[PDB]
């Protein structure tokens, strides 16, 4: 049914990109819905602090307000897969910004942030070379972030989910891991590059007009000497960012992008388990 | 072991008398000079406090809510927080008084970000208007520093609006346009015939009329085609949050419409799609007049101007005409104050300089031989000059450099200066101290 | 659209270990080097910050709790209140730190009274023994305006006493009397071999005696009959509370005795009457075990001494000797420290000084004309002099009574004490400069 | 049964005077354990808001833990009169102090703060003049606060009840008319003046070596001009005064002794009713 806190991209469901942000609190949606791109910029709210998934049934999962509402609001059906995969039986490689990129025939790569299908990526004339299945480094196919494989149909009306939460405690033991264990039960998400996590500058400076985004600590010292008359501004938290900031963090984000691997049953019981 | 007889009546009285001293501190009724609600005083003031080293400087909302209690509060932290939020941010002040840096909330969502991330200062807005604040009463309970009401050049309360509920009163203020306040104001200066102040709610793009004595909140809309339909504002009451659940969810739970969300920074706005179930007459009028109903888009709001007088007593004005003529009467005599304690200033400022211009010209030429005594010596030869005795420790308490050429001429032109400014803070009234001060604001 | 390829190892153990370092910012287990718990240490600074301007001023320590926030506090007000309460009370503290007015409690009753009520300074105990606070290490977290730890004289550690519990360790150092413990110190910066400090609990009439490596804190009664017994101290963990219901209470159920209440001002005390039920033998020996026994006026306590070394590392020692040598050993490194920081002040106030002692005597006798010129110009005559050299600012900047003769001898003799000064820090060590810190607490 | 917080006087139910307190906060008694006389001087703690007690039924007055430990503490039986006044048909006035007080012969008189049987008085060759029973003045009688009320035989073990209260909000509408009704089920205690309210002080000066004590703001202001270098010192609760002024406020309490008049039971429903 409909959500009330669902502000919802136009091109929701519409074999188009989505980028649904999970910001928690009401309050750090007030940028949102006026710097949305009003087509691909869906969000919804959540204040409080998400129950533990890992022990509790499926069919209960449903009882939970906020539970249900992320599985209503990207149309998620509990116990199948989120998309369905289309065979393939080619491979090919290919250099990019001086990494080599391994591909399939039937897979999408993100070039300046769009995707491009690879059939018409071969159109264009730029080397692709063939490779065996047997060759192919799985381990490295899996781990690239600029190759989404092979989908064929989707029952998602919202492509990508976009984590973003604060910096300080109110953002570490808190929603931060607790959602991860929830699209836990599609492990296919994390591998497809869906889950993604929006990283929040901590350290801001004021040299001049612009100003200068260090998402960590480690990054402000060693660019400290560099900085001419940096003012000094700790973002420990979404509301602390102003309106033109939080455009630019929407507009033009730094994606932490969440990948499961082979041992990610294990972790989701040491934390939170 | 005094045994009093004291009976029950005061002990029963006595428990009155303080509760409602207890709430005559924190009436939610606005002070009509300084427009601050009690949570309201003490936040501005606290933020003047931190602003003191560094007038720029952004503190944390928690620190500054935080620091009330100190200052004589007594409703806790969690009461500053709203008001400190509430005054920052510019979707719902006309005139906002504290400059703040974070999520302070917008019209589509009203709600500020938690206390301890976003930042608030005082504005360039208050110090612009909100001046004489060394002249300001001082309250009667010692423990409240802060003074009883600031004294604000124009009624900050018909600014940024005002409302509250309290024990058999309520207060309803519109938010006044700055721009019309500001020559109401003027105008009851000069004692003319004073326009009624525009009412302009903040980032507003709506329509406001008055009607019989009625503030009808329109806004606006326009047509895309024959069934499509574009909301480009709304009523001020309505967030996004109450105006899609109240309005827009019956209306699409009814089947009349499938609305489509259009908000962005160019404040609210709404595509909605007429389906055949709802009924469109064919006529301008009746289809303008049906769509503001059903759509909510008409409001109307009347304003019950209660506000505390200078002398603390609950005040009921029919119209912001008679505040505004009020509020220069009783804005008049502070700038008498200002005047009379000026001339003593700029008079006791202009013999310490005259006097300590005088050093000089005796010193370089022949007169004061500074030159080889004892201090307590030196005193006293001076000390005898009537003149020189009134500021006898200032005058010599004196750096060397004064003894030159030219800091010598530039003391003496500051002491003919301060004659000057003498001479015009004399020979000035509140008219023109007034209308000079109030020529400022922006 | 930077996408980054973070894994799920580096989200958890990133989420992991911050938990780790926000728990390690607030550890019960208090710093070797200045005896303070995080909360105590923002408590301290916080006292400090506010009674900066006024030394013997109390502040309510609703106001002291409020303000740890501003400092970089995380765990709220709560605890910076207990830790206020449980330092300026002299019942839980041999060397209280905090000289506290108010309801801070008693030995009867350990509970202090509500923190809006009671007010709280920073001591004369504090500037007595924390000194050198401007050398204290900044805290690696710049958020944490307080300094990783202040460096008192002596270990305050093992004065007031330090009991905590923290995730796999635990900390509990018995109260040492400030005397012995100054002792020590003292012994320890000569090398000598150190005495183990007495232990002395606060306001304790009780005896105190080290048996096998374990102290039993031993209460003191005195017999007023045969069967009339009047409890003159008990064990320093009871309170009139807790010993009452504890050890009273059933005793009484169990008709032993008929005990009645006598605690005064003097510390504890109860009177007890014997029933006939109760069996007590003829042998004094006998009898004193089976009192001290039943009622509980013996306690055995075992030392935990688990404090955080001056490099943020947990440490345990086994005996306060070895704690006290190494706690000597860094404060060393400081006191060095201020030798090398007061040598180079001193130097800098002597040429200052002398430099401005040569100004006045070059203008008294005939040298420097300050007797009509430019600023500017003066500037630059008297700083092509060498030795005028940078001290222009302060040198012109000077007052006119300087130029009288008393004044000139009292810059000559203030630039003859500052050379030796100067010359007395040259020429002295950390030994001499320690050993003289360590005459002024008491 | 034994209660727990009831630091007791030696001299409970032992036919003599009582001052038992009634002080909010275990914290505001701890002064009390070290600066009773250890002979009347008993004290109860009670933290929190008394229960309203006008209307209140008997059936749960005796379940509330506070209610009850206070009928236990001064041993009171609910619902009869805790007294039992001795008859007479004699009447005296006599001069006390410059003025005039209505007295009889089996009433007790206090005199320096010590109470003295009437017909113990009589033999110290004062003056008494005897009056007609028709024309005592009943009124300026039982509002007499130096003289009781023939007193025969009491079942109370603590003579006296001096609630102890302070002096902000945490007094004002709070806990300071609530024991007032309940009290109240015992009219006779009031005429008799038994129960009554220490004045803690407001205003303390500091002016040379021992203070001066200011129970009232309007004194503050009359007496302000004579105060050599006065230091002020708002003591806005019991937990604001060191152990020093607590025992002067003890040894020498100046009393609001509380007098219940023909109203009182119409005050009791106007506020808290």
Request: charged residues 30%; neutral net charge.
């Given at each position: 049914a409909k959500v009330h806190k669902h502000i919802k991209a136009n091109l929701c469901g519409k074999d188009a990109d989505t980028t649904l942000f999970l910001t928690e609190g009401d309050?750090?949606?007030?940028?949102?819905?006026?710097?949305?791109?009003?087509?691909?910029?869906?969000?919804?709210?959540?204040?409080?602090?998400?129950?533990?998934?890992?022990?509790?049934?499926?069919?209960?999962?449903?009882?939970?307000?906020?539970?249900?509402?992320?599985?209503?609001?990207?149309?998620?059906?509990?116990?199948?897969?989120?998309?369905?995969?289309?065979?393939?039986?080619?491979?090919?490689?290919?250099?990019?910004?001086?990494?080599?990129?391994?591909?399939?025939?039937?897979?999408?790569?993100?070039?300046?942030?769009?995707?491009?299908?690879?059939?018409?990526?071969?159109?264009?004339?730029?080397?692709?070379?063939?490779?065996?299945?047997?060759?192919?480094?799985?381990?490295?196919?899996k781990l690239q972030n600029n190759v989404r494989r092979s989908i064929k149909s989707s029952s998602m009306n919202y492509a990508n989910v976009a984590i973003m939460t604060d910096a300080d405690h109110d953002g570490l033991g808190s929603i931060y891991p607790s959602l991860l264990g929830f699209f836990s039960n599609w492990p296919e998400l994390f591998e497809q590059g869906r889950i993604r996590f929006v990283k929040t500058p901590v350290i801001i400076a004021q040299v001049g007009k612009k100003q200068e985004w260090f998402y960590t600590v480690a990054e402000y010292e060693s660019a400290k000497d560099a900085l001419p008359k940096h003012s000094i501004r700790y973002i420990k938290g979404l509301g602390s960012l102003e309106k033109s900031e939080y455009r630019e963090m929407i507009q033009n984000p730094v994606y932490d992008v969440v990948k499961l691997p082979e041992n990610w049953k294990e972790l989701f019981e040491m934390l939170m388990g | 072991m005094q045994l009093n007889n004291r009976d029950l009546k005061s002990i029963i009285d006595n428990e009155a008398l303080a509760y409602a001293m207890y709430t005559v501190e924190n009436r939610a009724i606005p002070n009509m000079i300084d427009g601050f609600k009690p949570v309201q005083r003490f936040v501005i003031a606290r933020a003047l406090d931190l602003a003191r080293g560094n007038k720029d400087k952004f503190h944390k909302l928690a620190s500054i809510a935080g620091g009330v209690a100190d200052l004589g509060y007594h409703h806790g932290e969690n009461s500053a927080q709203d008001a400190g939020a509430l005054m920052a941010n510019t979707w719902n002040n006309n005139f906002p008084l504290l400059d703040g840096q974070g999520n302070f909330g917008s019209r589509t969502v009203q709600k500020a970000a938690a206390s301890r991330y976003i930042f608030a200062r005082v504005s360039k807005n208050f110090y612009n208007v909100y001046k004489d604040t060394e002249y300001a009463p001082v309250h009667q309970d010692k423990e409240h520093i802060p003074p009883a009401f600031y004294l604000p050049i124009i009624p900050t309360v018909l600014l940024n609006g005002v409302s509250g509920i309290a024990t058999g009163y309520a207060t309803y203020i519109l938010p006044h346009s700055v721009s019309s306040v500001?020559?109401?104001?003027?105008?009851?200066?000069?004692?003319?015939?004073?326009?009624?102040?525009?009412?302009?709610?903040?980032?507003?793009?709506?329509?406001?009329?008055?009607?019989?004595?009625?503030?009808?909140?329109?806004?606006?809309?326009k047509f895309t085609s024959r069934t499509q339909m574009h909301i480009t504002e709304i009523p001020y009451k309505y967030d996004r949050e109450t105006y899609v659940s109240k309005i827009l969810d019956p209306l699409e739970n009814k089947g009349f419409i499938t609305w489509d969300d259009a908000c962005g920074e160019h404040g609210f706005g709404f595509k909605v799609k007429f389906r055949k179930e709802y009924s469109l007459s064919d006529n301008e009028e009746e289809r303008h007049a049906?769509?503001?109903?059903?759509?909510?888009?008409?409001?109307?709001?009347?304003?019950?101007?209660?506000?505390?007088?200078?002398?603390?007593?609950?005040?009921?004005?029919?119209?912001?005409?008679?505040?505004?003529?009020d509020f220069v009467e009783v804005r008049k005599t502070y700038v008498q104050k200002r005047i009379d304690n000026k001339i003593k200033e700029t008079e006791s400022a202009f013999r310490l300089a005259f006097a300590k211009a005088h050093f000089i010209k005796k010193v370089i030429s022949?007169?004061?031989?500074?030159?080889?005594?004892?201090?307590?010596?030196?005193?006293?030869?001076?000390?005898?000059?009537?003149?020189?005795?009134?500021?006898?420790?200032?005058?010599?308490?004196?750096?060397i450099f004064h003894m030159t050429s030219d800091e010598a001429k530039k003391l003496a032109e500051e002491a003919k200066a301060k004659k000057e400014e003498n001479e015009y803070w004399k020979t000035t009234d509140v008219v023109t101290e007034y209308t000079k001060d109030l020529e400022e604001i922006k």
């Open positions: 309050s750090a949606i007030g940028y949102l819905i006026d710097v949305r791109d009003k087509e691909l910029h869906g969000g919804y709210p959540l204040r409080g602090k998400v129950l533990n998934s890992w022990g509790m049934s499926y069919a209960d999962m449903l009882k939970n307000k906020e539970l249900f509402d992320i599985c209503a609001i990207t149309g998620l059906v509990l116990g199948e897969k989120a998309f369905e995969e289309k065979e393939d039986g080619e491979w090919f490689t290919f250099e990019l910004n001086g990494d080599t990129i391994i591909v399939n025939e039937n897979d999408e790569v993100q070039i300046n942030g769009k995707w491009i299908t690879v059939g018409e990526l071969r159109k264009n004339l730029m080397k692709f070379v063939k490779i065996d299945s047997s060759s192919v480094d799985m381990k490295k196919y | 500001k020559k109401a104001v003027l105008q009851a200066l000069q004692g003319k015939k004073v326009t009624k102040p525009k009412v302009e709610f903040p980032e507003f793009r709506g329509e406001v009329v008055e009607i019989d004595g009625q503030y009808e909140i329109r806004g606006t809309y049906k769509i503001m109903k059903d759509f909510g888009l008409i409001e109307r709001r009347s304003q019950n101007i209660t506000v505390i007088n200078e002398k603390g007593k609950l005040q009921v004005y029919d119209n912001v005409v008679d505040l505004i003529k022949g007169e004061i031989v500074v030159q080889g005594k004892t201090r307590k010596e030196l005193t006293e030869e001076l000390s005898k000059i009537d003149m020189y005795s009134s500021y006898v420790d200032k005058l010599v308490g004196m750096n």
